[PDB]
Amino acid sequence: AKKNQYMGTSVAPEIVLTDKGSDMSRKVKTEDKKVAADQAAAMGILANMSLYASLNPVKRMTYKAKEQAPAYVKKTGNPVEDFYPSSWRNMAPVIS
Amino acid sequence: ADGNKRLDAVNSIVSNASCMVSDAVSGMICENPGLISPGGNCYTNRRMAACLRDGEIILRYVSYALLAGDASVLEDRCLNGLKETYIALGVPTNSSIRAVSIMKAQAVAFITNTATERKMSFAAGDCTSLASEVASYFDRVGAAIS
Amino acid sequence: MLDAFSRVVVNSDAKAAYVGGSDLQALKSFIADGNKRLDAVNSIVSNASCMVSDAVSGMICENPGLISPGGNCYTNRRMAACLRDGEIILRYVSYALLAGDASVLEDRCLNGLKETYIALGVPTNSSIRAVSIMKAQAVAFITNTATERKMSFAAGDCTSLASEVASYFDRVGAAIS
Amino acid sequence: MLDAFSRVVVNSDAKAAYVGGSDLQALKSFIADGNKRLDAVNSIVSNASCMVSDAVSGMICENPGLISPGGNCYTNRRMAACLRDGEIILRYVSYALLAGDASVLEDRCLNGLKETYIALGVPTNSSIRAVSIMKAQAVAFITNTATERKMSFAAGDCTSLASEVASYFDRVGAAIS
Amino acid sequence: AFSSIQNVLTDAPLGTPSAMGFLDERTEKPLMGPSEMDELVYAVYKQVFGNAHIMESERAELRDAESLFRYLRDVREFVRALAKSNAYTSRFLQGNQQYRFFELNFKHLLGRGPRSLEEMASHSALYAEGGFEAVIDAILDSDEYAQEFGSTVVPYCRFKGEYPTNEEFNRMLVLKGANSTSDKAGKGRSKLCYSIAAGCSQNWLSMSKALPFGTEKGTGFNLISSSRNPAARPRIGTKIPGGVVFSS
Amino acid sequence: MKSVITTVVSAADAAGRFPSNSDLESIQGNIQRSAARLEAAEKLAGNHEAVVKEAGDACFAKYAYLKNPGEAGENQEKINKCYRDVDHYMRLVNYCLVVGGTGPLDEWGIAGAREVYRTLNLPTSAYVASIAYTRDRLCVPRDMSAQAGVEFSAYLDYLINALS
Amino acid sequence: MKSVITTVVSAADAAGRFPSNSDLESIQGNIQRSAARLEAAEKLAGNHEAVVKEAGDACFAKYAYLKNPGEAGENQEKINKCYRDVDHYMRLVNYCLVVGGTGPLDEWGIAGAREVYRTLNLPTSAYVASIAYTRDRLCVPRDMSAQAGVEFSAYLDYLINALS
Amino acid sequence: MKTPITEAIATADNQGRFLSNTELQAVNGRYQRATASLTAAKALTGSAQRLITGAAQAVYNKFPYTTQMPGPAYASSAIGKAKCARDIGYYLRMVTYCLVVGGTGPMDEYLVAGLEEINRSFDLSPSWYIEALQYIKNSHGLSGQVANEANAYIDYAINTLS
Ligand SMILES: *C(=C)C1=C(C)[C@@H](Cc2[nH]c(/C=C3N=C(/C=C4\NC(=O)[C@H](C)[C@H]4CC)C(C)=C\3CCC(=O)O)c(CCC(=O)O)c2C)NC1=O
Ligand SMILES: C=CC1=C(C)[C@@H](Cc2[nH]c(/C=C3N=C(/C=C4\NC(=O)[C@H](C)[C@H]4CC)C(C)=C\3CCC(=O)O)c(CCC(=O)O)c2C)NC1=O
Ligand SMILES: C=CC1=C(C)[C@@H](Cc2[nH]c(/C=C3N=C(/C=C4\NC(=O)[C@H](C)[C@H]4CC)C(C)=C\3CCC(=O)O)c(CCC(=O)O)c2C)NC1=O
Ligand SMILES: C=CC1=C(C)[C@@H](Cc2[nH]c(/C=C3N=C(/C=C4\NC(=O)[C@H](C)[C@H]4CC)C(C)=C\3CCC(=O)O)c(CCC(=O)O)c2C)NC1=O
Ligand SMILES: C=CC1=C(C)[C@@H](Cc2[nH]c(/C=C3N=C(/C=C4\NC(=O)[C@H](C)[C@H]4CC)C(C)=C\3CCC(=O)O)c(CCC(=O)O)c2C)NC1=O
Ligand SMILES: C=CC1=C(C)[C@@H](Cc2[nH]c(/C=C3N=C(/C=C4\NC(=O)[C@H](C)[C@H]4CC)C(C)=C\3CCC(=O)O)c(CCC(=O)O)c2C)NC1=O
Ligand SMILES: C=CC1=C(C)[C@@H](Cc2[nH]c(/C=C3N=C(/C=C4\NC(=O)[C@H](C)[C@H]4CC)C(C)=C\3CCC(=O)O)c(CCC(=O)O)c2C)NC1=O
Ligand SMILES: C=CC1=C(C)[C@@H](Cc2[nH]c(/C=C3N=C(/C=C4\NC(=O)[C@H](C)[C@H]4CC)C(C)=C\3CCC(=O)O)c(CCC(=O)O)c2C)NC1=O
Ligand SMILES: C=CC1=C(C)[C@@H](Cc2[nH]c(/C=C3N=C(/C=C4\NC(=O)[C@H](C)[C@H]4CC)C(C)=C\3CCC(=O)O)c(CCC(=O)O)c2C)NC1=O
Ligand SMILES: C=CC1=C(C)[C@@H](Cc2[nH]c(/C=C3N=C(/C=C4\NC(=O)[C@H](C)[C@H]4CC)C(C)=C\3CCC(=O)O)c(CCC(=O)O)c2C)NC1=O
Ligand SMILES: C=CC1=C(C)[C@@H](Cc2[nH]c(/C=C3N=C(/C=C4\NC(=O)[C@H](C)[C@H]4CC)C(C)=C\3CCC(=O)O)c(CCC(=O)O)c2C)NC1=O
Ligand SMILES: C=CC1=C(C)[C@@H](Cc2[nH]c(/C=C3N=C(/C=C4\NC(=O)[C@H](C)[C@H]4CC)C(C)=C\3CCC(=O)O)c(CCC(=O)O)c2C)NC1=O
Ligand SMILES: C=CC1=C(C)[C@@H](Cc2[nH]c(/C=C3N=C(/C=C4\NC(=O)[C@H](C)[C@H]4CC)C(C)=C\3CCC(=O)O)c(CCC(=O)O)c2C)NC1=O
Ligand SMILES: CCC1=C(C)/C(=C/C2=NC(=C\c3[nH]c(/C=C4\NC(=O)[C@H](C)[C@H]4CC)c(C)c3CCC(=O)O)/C(CCC(=O)O)=C2C)NC1=O
């Protein structure tokens, strides 16, 4: 009796305007449309803002970030696979 | 009344909408980088895309409400109980209000054609009434959540 | 209350130990940057009013419900009080920065403040935001990183003092939480 | 014995079809409101003895013929048995409020209570007065409108639970009517 | 104003004989003699400091305030000299919360409790505008101080009977403890911090602990909780020949 | 001991069946509410002698007649054992805050208490009045958290309703 | 007079004790820094008729309306009054630079300035504009040594904060 | 219980039919008559103990022999006066119940059903209660339809007593 019917739908109006300098060309149209979530476009802004936050020194002290505990991986005793596993080994950052 | 000022104001927003959204969320991260810290709720890949989608939906609705000249559809569709849904999911409301104010600044920059990164070609006149109207419309969505 | 020199004295008194040459590493280095701390404290207290007026306005900026009727900061009377409390928190963190010890913060200012705010109905989150803005401003002024407000200093790093004052603001933020 | 979850199972087993979609709104609202339900059953359970004693004392002080010589609550044996009958009923109404369905109240308390009181000669209508006094105590304890004791709750609205326990109590009064 | 327990369950207040000698043609007051003046100062120390167990190394600094007192008998100026000393500020202000210092002044120099939030606000504004000495001067030169104690008696916790508000009575008993109760139990953290800003009242047991002897203290406590419910809307009815009428 | 685990393994043992999903589902809530009840129990453990002293004098303040001769609180040996029994009840409440159920109360303080207190002329109303005083002097922010106060007052009301 | 000596001897008076070495240490602090502090003494003393006008005209330029009818600067000798009234503040900052503390300023120019500046309708923004003008009109190497400029500005922005 | 609601339900159930528009109009009449009857109930509630005392005094002034004749039926002693005031309060309570309910449903159930049995056995004359009800009708101090609605339930009791 009180729930918004379209709160969980992500449906928003699309507006398209056409204008080519002549009165016969001007036309506005509006149709509802589901707004999708781009998986790829968020990654670039996430990486760039993470790099910016990693380089900012004054946000480093005013916003002390929290430690994240690593995932469980079994140790094998030999240190070459304990400290430098193949998922990481020989990776190093280019600065351009 | 007059549409040639109104339709220009809508067209000055719906064209460069994606840059406004992507600049608003990146500025919101740019103030506090806790949301992209592991443990923030924009940290994962699925979350920041949803945040982008929500910002674009808010911009979609306020651009439609500026065209319609009223805010009734804006409070029927979007703001009908958004704040407690952000509470129930768990959403830092102050940062979303901050992103809304960033989008509000960008919209009134684009309407007055005083944007200092890009220039539109317009006619001669004053669109400040539409600027105050869209400022009020952004204050609606800024006050409907808290 | 205590300061940096009276810190180590009470720490060593718990051991009944004399303050020997091994423990004066810390204090003699504390005296090395003595001019640095004095150069920092007047920079902060020199902008005291602007920092508070900016802080409460920033509070209000992303929480417009505080102005609204029934808001905790609705009438000017309430505003006047909340604008004081900026002066009191800032004054006490300046005292703590000057003394090099926060032994004056949570006995004098932060002792019982959470309950006082709970009884008065003061919202905690907005106050924490106000403290945060002030914190950010604190470091901006210590490091001469403010956009305007160019202050003449002596060249070097005051980063340690910046982290000190950030830690002091941290306590205030966590005391009322 | 069926709770709120089992009730839709028995309702859709008469249908012979899988339950999802339409029938899940009530269950998801039952889950989302579960903290208030536990918060209400705890408030009723914490004040049980005062409720039973106050209800029986009110029923006697409205009708003093029960402690009259030859009345039904005359001796100590009958008074102890009435206090036991009182809250035996409170226990089952608490079970029905916790389960979200009054099926446990029907099967173990009210099935045959009508003529049990008849065979005993128990006046079936002073029991209705005691039940109504217990109902009036239960709604005030749920909605925190109790004048003798105030409890600690998170702020919000739970008059649906008050109407549900009032809906259980008049059923428990009308089964013996 | 009857003080059902002021002068019968409690001793009489202590101080100077009378104010007529203050009119001073040949002397300022009848020389109470040095042996009825040392007990006056002992009484003042027990009040303005409130059983602070002050050693004589710390009583070697109050020599000047004392030496003028026995020479010129105004009591009020004696406490004005005491409350501005380092012995007073070190004890109640140095390591305390703000309203803790403000509330301790009501116990020490006025012998009552703060009646409202606005009194505390007024003290706070008066402190912020230039010093704490202004706080003590406002209290001491107050009207309330003139029409309670004056320039003759030690300021004591008087049971007035006819309080301007009841919470004033509650908060008088909470600050005043029992004997052998001092003012450094809590490290700051005033007892009325919450209850002033909220408006509720205090613990019944801690008020009853400070009552005098023979006052049936503590009894009459129903076994359910003590703080009343504001939310409650009980129905109270009267008695009429025809029925019971409820007034709403 | 009456707890969350013991009820469901006793039910599965009475039925003679393996632990099903409902049994494990009941332990997830133990995992949830242990975050509140354990830090209630720890705060009770760290400050218990203040509470036992504070609730002991409320008993004699409400009932001053116990110190008269012929009563149960005449000399210091009775008052010391009064404080000892109040400390026993507070320890059992600390135990029930840990185990998650009313097991240690129901078996070490409640069962058989009525025959002892009637036989040894101990008035139960004054064994109740200390527990009643302890409940009303609780502020969730000041003394513990919000759910810890609920968890504490629930066991206090259980002890009060058992002795009354 | 809020000075370095008046603080310590007043503290000793309140405590009723003799001056200890902790007290003498502050006067040693004076011994170092008077030389830097009093180097600006000439700079304000011999150059003061130039700073006042450079300040008053900046005040009147930043708020041009104040010369309008009904405002503070409506005739001539009120403007002369204004220039005098900033001359007073320059005199007081010189006095404070000499005493070492904010003694002279907060009791001769600041104490009670509120009543006069409101009832005579004098906008404090105009005072703070003129003072902030001189605060950044200073160039440290040419005007003074390095440390005189710090302390002169520290005294100036004192009253800037006090007024605003 | 005779309400406009329950008689409409009883007429629909007698045919065994659903609620027609006849019943809905009969209920709607109760709803836009109720606003004055609830005011009459409030006003008779407020003036209750004054009206009961005045009505008892008016009965004693009209029939002075009731305060003089010995016997259990008369108000010559104190318990007799207490029971007389109790009876007048009973009558006023039934009148208020009929006002808020909207018909002569309560007082038909509680007062007049088997009333003259009591007056014949207990030997209490109905003219006393008629004299009390006439005072209550003359002295309630109402106006308009509030008065028209309270008086209409008063003289129903008067008509049943006569
Ligand atoms: C509301 C949307 C909103 C505001 C109101 C306004 C308040 C605000 N300002 C900052 C950032 C700064 N404040 C500064 C303070 C001053 N600048 C000066 O020149 C004087 C001396 C003084 C007071 C006027 C400065 C220098 C900054 C820049 C950042 C810095 O710290 O140097 C914020 C952000 C808070 C923070 O994170 O620092 C806010 C909220 N801004 C608004 O957005
Ligand atoms: C169907 C699509 C459609 C549009 C997009 C608009 C486009 C548009 N705007 C105007 C015309 C105009 N547009 C503006 C608007 C502005 N001028 C400014 O200086 C401000 C920056 C800005 C306000 C935001 C003004 C002031 C006029 C002239 C007055 C008017 O005709 O409204 C005109 C008529 C003359 C011209 O070409 O300029 C047209 C076609 N009208 C339409 O029919
Ligand atoms: C019809 C109107 C309409 C909206 C306004 C949005 C509102 C909205 N957002 C989310 C859901 C979400 N919304 C956000 C957004 C944010 N979180 C943050 O920290 C930022 C402040 C902000 C982006 C800037 C995130 C991160 C989620 C995912 C939460 C999760 O991890 O589950 C959900 C839950 C369902 C879903 O995931 O889509 C809804 C209804 N969706 C709508 O359909
Ligand atoms: C790391 C921290 C970080 C930030 C704080 C923000 C920086 C930022 N820039 C703008 C400000 C703006 N942002 C835009 C948006 C755009 N400009 C265009 O020309 C495009 C069409 C579109 C996407 C690029 C515009 C037009 C302005 C106003 C600039 C102007 O006045 O012309 C705003 C909003 C108003 C303001 O505060 O200035 C913010 C928050 N970006 C960051 O990365
Ligand atoms: C020594 C340390 C010290 C402090 C920190 C303050 C703390 C403090 N604030 C207030 C009193 C108040 N404090 C506030 C402050 C605020 N309300 C808000 O919503 C904001 C979060 C915040 C401003 C930023 C307000 C608005 C009132 C008064 C509200 C009212 O009752 O009208 C009071 C009550 C005093 C009184 O009036 O009697 C106290 C003690 N005082 C002190 O002595
Ligand atoms: C009585 C008041 C009083 C003061 C205000 C200070 C003033 C002061 N600061 C420094 C001296 C200094 N001040 C700084 C500080 C800085 N340099 C920078 O470039 C950073 C922006 C900033 C960090 C906060 C540094 C780095 C030195 C030199 C190192 C040092 O002296 O310890 C010195 C010694 C050398 C000099 O004269 O410059 C003095 C006297 N001392 C006092 O006695
Ligand atoms: C796990 C065991 C368990 C309990 C011991 C109780 C304790 C309890 N109550 C509530 C939480 C609550 N309880 C109530 C109920 C009320 N509040 C009122 O003001 C009314 C007086 C009353 C209803 C009439 C409300 C309104 C909430 C807020 C959350 C919600 O609405 O669900 C919550 C969730 C929020 C919180 O953690 O505080 C919990 C755990 N509930 C449980 O789940
Ligand atoms: C599972 C559900 C369940 C119940 C509800 C009770 C129902 C119940 N009550 C009584 C028995 C009784 N119940 C009452 C109670 C009352 N009489 C009054 O006058 C009051 C109205 C009312 C108390 C408020 C009394 C007085 C008796 C005893 C009658 C007697 O001793 O003769 C008996 C007979 C056995 C006995 O107790 O001796 C039973 C079965 N027992 C149950 O097992
Ligand atoms: C002549 C005999 C006689 C009595 C014995 C009492 C009994 C009594 N109590 C209440 C009414 C109530 N009784 C309780 C129960 C309690 N209240 C508390 O403070 C305790 C915690 C707990 C045990 C005493 C509550 C909570 C209410 C209603 C709300 C409230 O009072 O706060 C009611 C009204 C019930 C109703 O509305 O129908 C009655 C009749 N009154 C009488 O007239
Ligand atoms: C701030 C400055 C300051 C002072 C100088 C003293 C001055 C002073 N001396 C005395 C009081 C006295 N002063 C003296 C002193 C002396 N008698 C002599 O013969 C010698 C010349 C001299 C000692 C060398 C004596 C002997 C008494 C008390 C005598 C008595 O009455 O028994 C008193 C009275 C105080 C009182 O007891 O009430 C005062 C004010 N007090 C001060 O506050
Ligand atoms: C592990 C669980 C456990 C408990 C809960 C207690 C329960 C308990 N309490 C008492 C015993 C007591 N309890 C009291 C207390 C009181 N009597 C009064 O006068 C006041 C009413 C009140 C003070 C608070 C007294 C006086 C005794 C001793 C009785 C006696 O020896 O005469 C005894 C008798 C043995 C003894 O203590 O000497 C027992 C078993 N003991 C336990 O082992
Ligand atoms: C020792 C410290 C000390 C002071 C600072 C002054 C403060 C001061 N200035 C003025 C008086 C005045 N002051 C100004 C000054 C100004 N008008 C403005 O609008 C601007 C704020 C500013 C421009 C520079 C003017 C215009 C008057 C004349 C107004 C009047 O006298 O009514 C007066 C009123 C009496 C008079 O002097 O005629 C006083 C007390 N006096 C002191 O003794
Ligand atoms: C006692 C305090 C005191 C001051 C604050 C200054 C203020 C001041 N500056 C100038 C005058 C001047 N001041 C400078 C200096 C500078 N201009 C700039 O652009 C740079 C920011 C800065 C470097 C230090 C220059 C270049 C002039 C001549 C042009 C001018 O009037 O500004 C004059 C006129 C006489 C003079 O040259 O000194 C005065 C009073 N002088 C003082 O005596
Ligand atoms: C449901 C509503 C109701 C009505 C109407 C009612 C009437 C009523 N009035 C009674 C007695 C009485 N009524 C009166 C009243 C009066 N006699 C006078 O002389 C006065 C003039 C007059 C008072 C105005 C008296 C004196 C008695 C006692 C008579 C007796 O006991 O014999 C009795 C006998 C039982 C008893 O002793 O109480 C009944 C049943 N009872 C009810 O429950």
State the DSSP string of D92-156.
Answer: HHHHHHHHTSTHHHIIIIITTHHHHHHHHT--TTHHHHHHHHHHHHHHHHHTT--SS------SS
What is the torsion angle, in degrees rounded to the nearest 10, for the CA atoms of residue B81, residue B83, residue B88 and residue B92? 160
- Token pair, residue H107, equals 């007082």
Alpha-carbon distances of D21 from D5, D24, D100, E33, rounded to whole Å: 15, 6, 21, 97
Tally helices (H) and strands (E) across chain F.
9, 0
C48-62 and B93-111 are packed helices; what angle lies between their axes, rounded to 10 degrees?
Answer: 90
- Token pair, residue G130, equals 């003129």
G129 contacts G59 by C-beta, under 8 angstroms: yes
Sign, CA dihedral H145-H150-H156-H162, equals negative
Resolution in Å equals: 3.0
Alpha-carbon distances of H80 from D17, E191, E237, rounded to whole Å: 74, 61, 25
Q: Report the nearest-CA residue for atom 7 of ligand 10.
A: E67
E135 contacts E127 by C-beta, under 8 angstroms: yes
E134 contacts C147 by C-beta, under 8 angstroms: no
Q: What is the per-residue DSSP string for E90-102?
A: HHHTTTS-HHHHH
H87 contacts H129 by C-beta, under 8 angstroms: yes
- Token pair, residue B141, equals 């969505």
Q: Report phi then psi at A28, rounded to 5.
A: -110, 140
Residues of G in contact with E83 (CB under 8 A): none
Sign, CA dihedral G63-G66-G68-G70, equals positive
Query: Measured between CB atoms, does F128 come within 8 Å of chain D?
Result: no
Residues of C in contact with F146 (CB under 8 A): none
Which CATH class name applies to D1-177?
mainly alpha
Q: How far is the CA of F72 from the centre of ligand 11 (A)?
A: 10
G106 contacts E130 by C-beta, under 8 angstroms: no
**Does E99 sit within 8 Å of C116, measured CB to CB?**
yes
Beta-bridge partners for A11: A34
* Pairwise CA distance, residues G78 & G81, whole Å: 5
G90 contacts G135 by C-beta, under 8 angstroms: no
Q: How much helix, strand and coil, in percent to the nearest 5, is found in chain C?
A: 70, 0, 30
**Closest atom of ligand 7 relative to the D35 alpha carbon:** 43
E124 contacts E102 by C-beta, under 8 angstroms: yes
Judged on CB neighbours under 10 Å (0-12, 13-18, 19+), F15 is exposed
E45 Cβ neighbours under 8 A, 6+ residues apart: E54
How many CA atoms are closer than 13 Å to the CA of H110, on its beta-carbon side?
A: 16
Q: Report phi then psi at B40, rounded to 5.
A: -75, 165
* Pairwise CA distance, residues G8 & G19, whole Å: 8
Closest CA to E11 of E134, E159, E111, E133: E159
**Amino acid sitting at position F91:** R
G163 lines ligand 12 (CB under 6 A): no
Cα diameter, chain E: 80
**Does E193 sit within 8 Å of C112, measured CB to CB?**
yes
Instruction: Count how many pairs of residues, chain A against chain C, have C-beta atoms within 8 Å.
Output: 13
D145, D153, D157, best to mutate vs chain E, most E CBs in 10 Å: D145
H59 contacts H128 by C-beta, under 8 angstroms: yes
* Pairwise CA distance, residues C82 & E126, whole Å: 17
G100 Cβ neighbours under 8 A, 6+ residues apart: G3, G4, G30, G34, G37
Tally helices (H) and strands (E) across chain H.
9, 0
Alpha-carbon distances of D147 from D103, D141, D164, F137, H152, rounded to whole Å: 32, 9, 22, 18, 41
Closest CA to F147 of G146, D153, D10, H161: D153
Q: What is the per-residue DSSP string for C7-27?
A: HHHHHHHTTT----GGGHHHH
A51 contacts B25 by C-beta, under 8 angstroms: no
The alpha carbons of chain H give a radius of gyration, in whole angstroms, of 18
With tokens 């039952």, the residue in question is D30
With tokens 């729930």, the residue in question is A3
Q: How far is the CA of G151 from the centre of ligand 13 (A)?
A: 18
Q: How far is the CA of G19 from the centre of ligand 6 (A)?
A: 30
Residue range F1-164 in CATH 1.10.490.20: yes
Alpha-carbon distances of C34 from C25, C38, C39, C157, rounded to whole Å: 14, 6, 9, 13
The DSSP secondary-structure symbol of B38 reads: B
The DSSP secondary-structure symbol of E22 reads: G
H80 lines ligand 14 (CB under 6 A): yes
Residues of C in contact with B97 (CB under 8 A): 62-63
Judged on CB neighbours under 10 Å (0-12, 13-18, 19+), B77 is buried
Our CA-based measurement puts residue A73 at a distance from the nearest CA of chain B, in whole angstroms, of 19
* Pairwise CA distance, residues G105 & G91, whole Å: 9
Query: Measured between CB atoms, does F69 come within 8 Å of chain C?
Result: no
Q: Report the nearest-CA residue for atom 41 of ligand 14.
A: H87
C95 contacts C171 by C-beta, under 8 angstroms: no
Q: Which fold has domain B1-146?
A: Globin-like (1.10.490)
F154 lines ligand 7 (CB under 6 A): no
Ranges of H-type helices in H65-123: 78-101, 106-110, 115-121
- Show the 3-state SS of chain G: CCCHHHHHHHHHHHHCCCCCHHHHHHHHHHHHHHHHHHHHHHHHHHCHHHHHHHHHHHHHHHCHHHHCCCCCCCCHHHHHHHHHHHHHHHHHHHHHHHHCCCHHHHHHCCCCHHHHHHHCCCCHHHHHHHHHHHHHHCCHHHHCCHHHHHHHHHHHHHHHHHHC
- Token pair, residue D58, equals 């009110």
**Amino acid sitting at position F36:** A
Ranges of each domain in chain B: 1-146
Query: Measured between CB atoms, does C129 come within 8 Å of chain A?
Result: no
Q: How far is the CA of E20 from the centre of ligand 10 (A)?
A: 24
Our CA-based measurement puts residue A33 at a distance from the nearest CA of chain B, in whole angstroms, of 10
Residue of chain E whose alpha carbon sits nearest to that of D152: E229
Closest CA to E58 of E27, E19, E88: E88
The DSSP secondary-structure symbol of C64 reads: G
* Pairwise CA distance, residues G63 & G57, whole Å: 10
Closest CA to E42 of E10, E78, E92, E11: E78
| Experimental technique | cryo-EM
Closest CA to E74 of E29, E114, E131, E11: E29
C51 contacts C134 by C-beta, under 8 angstroms: yes
Closest CA to E99 of E135, E130, E133: E135
Sign, CA dihedral E52-E55-E61-E66, equals positive
Nearest by CB to D49, which of F140, F154, F164?
A: F164
E98 lines ligand 5 (CB under 6 A): yes
Binding-site residues of C for (2R,3E)-phycoerythrobilin, in ranges, read 82, 158
Q: How far is the CA of B47 from the centre of ligand 3 (A)?
A: 8
Helix, strand or coil, per DSSP, at residue F163: helix
Ranges of H-type helices in E70-116: 75-83, 86-92, 98-105
E40 Cβ neighbours under 8 A, 6+ residues apart: E14, E15, E16, E32, E154
E224 contacts D141 by C-beta, under 8 angstroms: no
Helix, strand or coil, per DSSP, at residue D72: coil
Q: Report phi then psi at E246, rounded to 5.
A: -110, 130
* Pairwise CA distance, residues C173 & H89, whole Å: 67
H98 is in an annotated binding site: no
With tokens 């979350």, the residue in question is B47
**Closest atom of ligand 7 relative to the F151 alpha carbon:** 5
What is the torsion angle, in degrees rounded to the nearest 10, for the CA atoms of residue E53, residue E57, residue E58 and residue E60? 130
- Token pair, residue E82, equals 């005491």
Q: Report phi then psi at A18, rounded to 5.
A: -125, 125
